[PDB]
């Protein structure tokens, strides 16, 4: 219980926003702000079927991206109930994927989609049935 | 590119963090910290939003009782008074008593947040959660 | 087999387009054009489950319209798989309803939705499973 | 308003028409003739379309094999070359081998029809049907 140093990797876009926030909010380093973000954000996956929504924003000019997300969905074990796509601007589409699955299936789907080249983000909203 | 840098932290905080890597699906501590950072930067961005900005995007996810008469209109009237622009909405019926709706919204951070708050307060609405995006993520 | 006279009622908007088409295409009366339309368009509902899509365009400022369409859907016997709405212009929304049901259920849904005040049209696309 | 007028017809044509009223769900001959008229007026309108017009709306409904690799990209590439604007697309999986997609399109009548024709010719596409609308119906 004592100070440890570890490494973190960010895409330029996130790193750039980080550095602006450090400057805007009066922090003295990346380490200091990230450390504070972790402390703040720190304050059980199971087999039960849950409905979830994954919002993905992606580059609509990235070839085979939709195919790779389909491939990911097909293998995930989740059941896709619906997907909707709209063009949000000149470079990006926004897709919502409404799906059912257990925690492990849905989490893996979100992380695999999120790490695709051309995917700007993939944010999951989960509703377990106690939430309704 | 993608840039690597160091962070310093108490070992017992690092132990609470390392606790959460594998169980949440991550291959490394780095991936999990990245998502905490993304999440917090988007919140900070939405907090400083110009009231003159009307270009924020978000998705509101709502679970509600579709057999509750007048709930649908009350939601429409709230949306019409919010100042936001609905780009697209999707509905699926989970069962005879739950409908899930996704609402794709454009507007000011205030107006969008207000919409979520007002919808979430209605009788028959079980769940109302915003997914926020910030232009630094996709521009 | 001999000539009969019957009556037809159209909303102003359809009647107006009819009269323009009569003039554009060289017809001499409504009766003549409608008679020709019928001849041309003339050239079995069952219990089998079919997937279908209903495209509805409607006035987004008509209060309780969505409620009435929901009421109609709920009573129809059809299972709605998904509905999507977009704003198409300043007065109109476009909704697509993807649904499963038998011929009688889906036909009744289309006709009941189509006759609502504020509904500009409701066009059904049906796929029986021999169509795929 | 809503305006009533008379139509003359041979009795044996009227008998083929009256054959189709109740079975197709109609309460009267008038309702069925109205829908034939709507259908034909929309077709005529789409046939005289200005190649300078890009404001027509239609929905393309497509059933296809979602497990056929590369079909998705081929459809995207066709849509990108069509000249049309996709406003929204929705996909549902009917089973492991059929997906139904609805595509909401804006463009010229030519470009939209061409898109339907090209998509419908692809291996793995089982069904591709346009629902057309004309501004006289909704403006």
UniProtKB/Swiss-Prot annotation, chains A, C:
Transcriptional regulator. Pfam families: NikR_C, RHH_1. Disulfide bonds: none annotated. InterPro entries: Acetolactate_synth/TF_NikR_C (IPR027271), ACT-like_dom_sf (IPR045865), Arc_rbn_hlx_hlx (IPR013321), CopG (IPR002145), CopG/NikR_regulator (IPR050192), Ni_resp_reg_NikR (IPR022988), Ribbon_hlx_hlx (IPR010985), TF_NikR_Ni-bd_C (IPR014864). The keyword Transferase does not apply. NCBIfam families: PRK00630.1, PRK01002.1, PRK02967.1, PRK04460.1. Ni(2+) binds at residues 74, 85, 87, 93. Binds 1 nickel ion per subunit. Belongs to the transcriptional regulatory CopG/NikR family. This is Putative nickel-responsive regulator. Homotetramer. Keywords: DNA-binding, Metal-binding, Nickel, Transcription, Transcription regulation. Its cofactor is Ni(2+). One of its GO terms (molecular function) is nickel cation binding. GO terms for biological process: negative regulation of DNA-templated transcription; regulation of DNA-templated transcription; response to nickel cation.
